[PDB]
Design a binder for this molecule. Structure first.
Ligand SMILES: NS(=O)(=O)c1nnc(NS(=O)(=O)c2cccc(C(=O)OCCCCO[N+](=O)[O-])c2)s1
Ligand SMILES: [Hg+2]
Ligand SMILES: [Zn+2]
Length: 256
Protein backbone atom coordinates (compact mmCIF):
# COMPACT_ATOMS: atom_id res chain seq x y z
CA UNK A 1 0.00 0.00 0.00
CA UNK A 2 0.77 3.75 -0.12
CA UNK A 3 3.78 5.28 1.58
CA UNK A 4 6.55 7.85 0.98
CA UNK A 5 9.31 5.81 -0.71
CA UNK A 6 10.61 5.26 -4.26
CA UNK A 7 8.01 2.57 -4.99
CA UNK A 8 4.90 3.67 -3.11
CA UNK A 9 5.42 7.48 -2.87
CA UNK A 10 3.29 10.50 -3.94
CA UNK A 11 4.21 9.90 -7.58
CA UNK A 12 2.51 6.45 -7.40
CA UNK A 13 -0.62 7.53 -5.56
CA UNK A 14 -2.60 8.42 -8.69
CA UNK A 15 -2.91 4.72 -9.61
CA UNK A 16 -5.22 3.76 -6.69
CA UNK A 17 -6.50 7.28 -6.14
CA UNK A 18 -7.17 8.98 -9.56
CA UNK A 19 -8.19 12.18 -7.76
CA UNK A 20 -4.42 12.62 -7.03
CA UNK A 21 -4.34 14.70 -10.25
CA UNK A 22 -7.69 16.40 -9.54
CA UNK A 23 -8.61 20.10 -9.57
CA UNK A 24 -8.30 20.99 -5.84
CA UNK A 25 -5.33 18.96 -4.53
CA UNK A 26 -3.01 19.73 -1.62
CA UNK A 27 -0.58 20.88 -0.60
CA UNK A 28 0.23 23.97 -2.76
CA UNK A 29 2.95 26.57 -2.75
CA UNK A 30 1.79 29.89 -1.34
CA UNK A 31 3.11 32.69 -3.49
CA UNK A 32 2.86 35.68 -1.07
CA UNK A 33 2.85 38.12 -4.00
CA UNK A 34 -0.11 36.50 -5.77
CA UNK A 35 -2.26 35.93 -2.65
CA UNK A 36 -4.89 38.62 -2.02
CA UNK A 37 -6.26 40.14 1.17
CA UNK A 38 -9.89 39.12 1.61
CA UNK A 39 -12.21 41.68 3.29
CA UNK A 40 -15.22 39.29 3.26
CA UNK A 41 -13.22 36.99 5.60
CA UNK A 42 -14.71 36.78 9.12
CA UNK A 43 -12.36 36.70 12.09
CA UNK A 44 -11.02 33.16 12.68
CA UNK A 45 -12.24 31.38 15.85
CA UNK A 46 -10.26 28.47 17.30
CA UNK A 47 -11.92 27.32 20.55
CA UNK A 48 -9.81 24.51 22.00
CA UNK A 49 -10.61 25.05 25.76
CA UNK A 50 -12.91 22.01 26.10
CA UNK A 51 -10.79 19.67 23.88
CA UNK A 52 -10.64 15.99 24.95
CA UNK A 53 -7.79 13.89 23.59
CA UNK A 54 -8.30 10.11 23.82
CA UNK A 55 -5.24 8.39 22.40
CA UNK A 56 -2.12 8.56 20.27
CA UNK A 57 -1.60 6.17 17.34
CA UNK A 58 1.30 5.32 15.00
CA UNK A 59 -0.63 4.60 11.77
CA UNK A 60 2.35 3.58 9.60
CA UNK A 61 2.36 7.14 8.11
CA UNK A 62 2.19 9.66 11.00
CA UNK A 63 0.90 9.76 14.52
CA UNK A 64 -2.64 10.90 15.15
CA UNK A 65 -3.63 12.46 18.41
CA UNK A 66 -7.31 11.57 18.60
CA UNK A 67 -10.17 13.51 20.18
CA UNK A 68 -13.61 12.65 21.46
CA UNK A 69 -15.85 14.61 19.05
CA UNK A 70 -19.21 13.17 20.25
CA UNK A 71 -19.86 16.64 21.67
CA UNK A 72 -19.44 20.18 20.38
CA UNK A 73 -16.33 21.01 22.49
CA UNK A 74 -13.18 21.76 20.37
CA UNK A 75 -14.21 23.83 17.30
CA UNK A 76 -13.11 25.99 14.35
CA UNK A 77 -15.46 28.70 13.16
CA UNK A 78 -14.99 32.02 11.34
CA UNK A 79 -12.55 32.79 8.56
CA UNK A 80 -13.64 31.23 5.24
CA UNK A 81 -15.78 28.74 7.19
CA UNK A 82 -19.53 28.69 7.46
CA UNK A 83 -20.93 27.03 10.57
CA UNK A 84 -19.17 24.69 12.95
CA UNK A 85 -16.23 22.35 12.38
CA UNK A 86 -15.38 19.80 15.12
CA UNK A 87 -11.81 18.77 15.98
CA UNK A 88 -11.33 15.05 15.31
CA UNK A 89 -7.51 14.63 15.26
CA UNK A 90 -4.08 16.14 14.77
CA UNK A 91 -0.83 14.95 13.18
CA UNK A 92 2.37 16.16 11.54
CA UNK A 93 4.62 15.79 8.49
CA UNK A 94 8.37 16.34 8.92
CA UNK A 95 11.73 15.83 7.22
CA UNK A 96 14.99 13.86 7.53
CA UNK A 97 16.86 17.19 7.58
CA UNK A 98 15.68 20.62 8.93
CA UNK A 99 15.42 22.13 5.40
CA UNK A 100 12.54 19.87 4.37
CA UNK A 101 9.36 18.54 5.94
CA UNK A 102 6.39 20.86 5.42
CA UNK A 103 3.74 20.09 2.87
CA UNK A 104 2.73 23.68 2.17
CA UNK A 105 5.62 25.99 1.17
CA UNK A 106 5.86 29.82 1.26
CA UNK A 107 7.40 31.34 -1.84
CA UNK A 108 8.89 27.83 -2.31
CA UNK A 109 10.37 27.82 1.25
CA UNK A 110 10.22 24.45 3.03
CA UNK A 111 9.96 24.42 6.85
CA UNK A 112 11.23 21.49 8.96
CA UNK A 113 7.65 20.32 9.71
CA UNK A 114 3.90 20.99 9.46
CA UNK A 115 1.05 20.39 11.88
CA UNK A 116 -2.50 19.69 10.73
CA UNK A 117 -5.45 19.93 13.05
CA UNK A 118 -8.37 18.24 11.28
CA UNK A 119 -12.07 19.27 11.72
CA UNK A 120 -15.44 18.05 10.32
CA UNK A 121 -18.46 20.24 9.52
CA UNK A 122 -21.09 19.45 12.05
CA UNK A 123 -24.07 20.03 9.63
CA UNK A 124 -23.07 16.53 8.30
CA UNK A 125 -23.55 14.69 11.61
CA UNK A 126 -20.53 12.44 11.35
CA UNK A 127 -17.06 12.61 9.95
CA UNK A 128 -17.91 9.85 7.45
CA UNK A 129 -20.75 11.89 5.96
CA UNK A 130 -18.65 15.06 5.98
CA UNK A 131 -16.02 13.55 3.64
CA UNK A 132 -18.63 12.96 0.99
CA UNK A 133 -18.92 16.78 1.01
CA UNK A 134 -17.05 19.55 -0.85
CA UNK A 135 -17.16 21.66 2.33
CA UNK A 136 -16.83 18.63 4.62
CA UNK A 137 -13.47 19.35 6.27
CA UNK A 138 -11.46 22.27 7.59
CA UNK A 139 -7.75 21.67 8.23
CA UNK A 140 -5.70 24.21 10.22
CA UNK A 141 -2.05 24.19 9.02
CA UNK A 142 0.89 25.35 11.14
CA UNK A 143 4.54 25.42 10.12
CA UNK A 144 7.42 24.30 12.36
CA UNK A 145 10.98 25.61 12.25
CA UNK A 146 13.87 24.53 14.42
CA UNK A 147 14.78 27.00 17.13
CA UNK A 148 13.85 27.10 20.81
CA UNK A 149 11.76 24.26 22.14
CA UNK A 150 7.99 24.25 22.17
CA UNK A 151 6.97 23.39 25.71
CA UNK A 152 3.40 22.55 24.66
CA UNK A 153 4.74 19.87 22.31
CA UNK A 154 6.83 18.05 24.96
CA UNK A 155 4.08 15.54 26.03
CA UNK A 156 3.75 14.39 22.44
CA UNK A 157 7.53 13.98 22.13
CA UNK A 158 7.93 11.94 25.34
CA UNK A 159 5.13 9.49 24.52
CA UNK A 160 6.65 8.58 21.11
CA UNK A 161 8.59 5.62 22.61
CA UNK A 162 5.15 4.22 23.51
CA UNK A 163 4.17 4.07 19.87
CA UNK A 164 7.38 3.33 17.98
CA UNK A 165 5.90 1.08 15.28
CA UNK A 166 2.93 0.76 12.91
CA UNK A 167 -0.02 -0.45 14.98
CA UNK A 168 0.85 0.84 18.43
CA UNK A 169 -1.45 3.15 20.38
CA UNK A 170 -1.07 4.89 23.73
CA UNK A 171 -3.62 6.28 26.04
CA UNK A 172 -3.28 10.03 25.50
CA UNK A 173 -5.90 11.94 27.54
CA UNK A 174 -5.94 15.65 28.67
CA UNK A 175 -3.64 17.00 25.94
CA UNK A 176 -4.18 20.69 25.21
CA UNK A 177 -3.72 21.61 21.53
CA UNK A 178 -3.79 25.29 22.51
CA UNK A 179 -0.11 24.67 23.38
CA UNK A 180 0.60 24.28 19.65
CA UNK A 181 -0.80 27.52 18.25
CA UNK A 182 1.54 30.39 17.40
CA UNK A 183 0.59 33.75 18.82
CA UNK A 184 -0.82 35.11 15.52
CA UNK A 185 -3.86 33.71 13.71
CA UNK A 186 -2.95 35.38 10.36
CA UNK A 187 -3.44 32.84 7.55
CA UNK A 188 -3.83 31.97 3.89
CA UNK A 189 -6.92 29.98 2.73
CA UNK A 190 -7.83 27.94 -0.33
CA UNK A 191 -10.10 24.96 -1.10
CA UNK A 192 -8.09 21.72 -1.24
CA UNK A 193 -7.72 18.04 -0.40
CA UNK A 194 -6.40 15.54 2.10
CA UNK A 195 -2.65 15.36 1.48
CA UNK A 196 -2.67 11.55 1.99
CA UNK A 197 -4.80 8.94 0.27
CA UNK A 198 -7.67 8.98 -0.36
CA UNK A 199 -6.78 12.65 -1.07
CA UNK A 200 -10.52 13.52 -0.88
CA UNK A 201 -11.24 17.08 -2.08
CA UNK A 202 -13.21 18.02 0.97
CA UNK A 203 -10.95 20.57 2.70
CA UNK A 204 -10.94 24.31 3.34
CA UNK A 205 -7.30 24.92 4.24
CA UNK A 206 -6.44 27.59 6.71
CA UNK A 207 -2.64 27.78 6.76
CA UNK A 208 -1.13 29.99 9.46
CA UNK A 209 1.60 32.47 8.48
CA UNK A 210 3.53 32.54 11.79
CA UNK A 211 5.35 29.24 12.30
CA UNK A 212 5.98 27.65 15.70
CA UNK A 213 9.56 26.88 16.61
CA UNK A 214 10.48 23.51 18.15
CA UNK A 215 13.92 22.27 19.33
CA UNK A 216 16.49 20.28 17.35
CA UNK A 217 16.08 17.64 20.08
CA UNK A 218 12.22 17.73 19.63
CA UNK A 219 12.14 17.14 15.80
CA UNK A 220 14.86 14.52 16.39
CA UNK A 221 12.45 12.28 18.35
CA UNK A 222 9.83 12.40 15.53
CA UNK A 223 12.63 11.05 13.32
CA UNK A 224 13.19 8.04 15.67
CA UNK A 225 9.64 6.90 14.93
CA UNK A 226 9.12 3.86 12.69
CA UNK A 227 7.18 3.39 9.46
CA UNK A 228 7.38 -0.41 9.88
CA UNK A 229 5.29 -2.49 12.33
CA UNK A 230 6.72 -4.39 15.32
CA UNK A 231 9.55 -6.78 14.44
CA UNK A 232 10.16 -5.64 10.84
CA UNK A 233 13.15 -3.98 9.04
CA UNK A 234 13.71 -0.47 10.43
CA UNK A 235 12.46 2.34 8.20
CA UNK A 236 12.77 5.61 10.06
CA UNK A 237 9.58 7.68 9.79
CA UNK A 238 11.08 10.68 7.96
CA UNK A 239 9.92 12.77 5.00
CA UNK A 240 6.27 11.78 5.35
CA UNK A 241 5.27 14.84 3.29
CA UNK A 242 3.58 15.39 -0.08
CA UNK A 243 5.16 18.04 -2.40
CA UNK A 244 3.27 21.12 -3.63
CA UNK A 245 0.51 20.35 -6.20
CA UNK A 246 -0.64 22.50 -9.16
CA UNK A 247 -2.76 25.46 -8.00
CA UNK A 248 -4.99 25.20 -11.13
CA UNK A 249 -5.92 28.92 -10.84
CA UNK A 250 -7.63 28.50 -7.52
CA UNK A 251 -7.00 31.71 -5.61
CA UNK A 252 -5.21 31.74 -2.26
CA UNK A 253 -6.74 34.42 -0.04
CA UNK A 254 -5.03 36.22 2.85
CA UNK A 255 -6.66 37.24 6.11
CA UNK A 256 -4.09 40.07 6.48
N1 LIG B 1 -3.02 15.75 6.09
S1 LIG B 1 -4.49 15.85 5.97
O1 LIG B 1 -4.77 16.48 4.63
O2 LIG B 1 -5.07 16.73 7.02
C1 LIG B 1 -5.12 14.30 6.19
N2 LIG B 1 -4.77 13.16 5.50
N3 LIG B 1 -5.49 12.00 5.94
C2 LIG B 1 -6.37 12.23 6.97
N4 LIG B 1 -7.19 11.27 7.58
S2 LIG B 1 -8.18 11.62 8.71
O3 LIG B 1 -9.25 12.33 8.08
O4 LIG B 1 -7.56 12.54 9.62
C3 LIG B 1 -8.92 10.51 9.64
C4 LIG B 1 -9.40 10.93 10.90
C5 LIG B 1 -10.06 10.08 11.79
C6 LIG B 1 -10.30 8.76 11.40
C7 LIG B 1 -9.87 8.31 10.15
C8 LIG B 1 -10.12 6.87 9.76
O5 LIG B 1 -9.66 5.97 10.45
O6 LIG B 1 -10.90 6.53 8.57
C9 LIG B 1 -10.29 6.43 7.28
C10 LIG B 1 -10.56 7.69 6.45
C11 LIG B 1 -10.68 7.40 4.96
C12 LIG B 1 -9.44 6.68 4.41
O7 LIG B 1 -9.66 5.28 4.19
N5 LIG B 1 -10.42 4.77 3.17
O8 LIG B 1 -10.63 3.39 3.10
O9 LIG B 1 -10.95 5.49 2.33
C13 LIG B 1 -9.18 9.18 9.27
S3 LIG B 1 -6.30 13.91 7.40
HG1 LIG C 1 -15.47 15.96 -0.83
ZN1 LIG D 1 -1.65 16.18 7.27
Amino acid sequence: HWGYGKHNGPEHWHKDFPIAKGERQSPVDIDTHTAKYDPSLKPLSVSYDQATSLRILNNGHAFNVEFDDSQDKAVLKGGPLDGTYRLIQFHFHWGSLDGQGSEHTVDKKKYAAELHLVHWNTKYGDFGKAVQQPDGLAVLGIFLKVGSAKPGLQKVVDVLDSIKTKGKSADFTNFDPRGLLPESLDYWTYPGSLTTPPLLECVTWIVLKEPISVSSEQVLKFRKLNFNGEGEPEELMVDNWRPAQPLKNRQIKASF
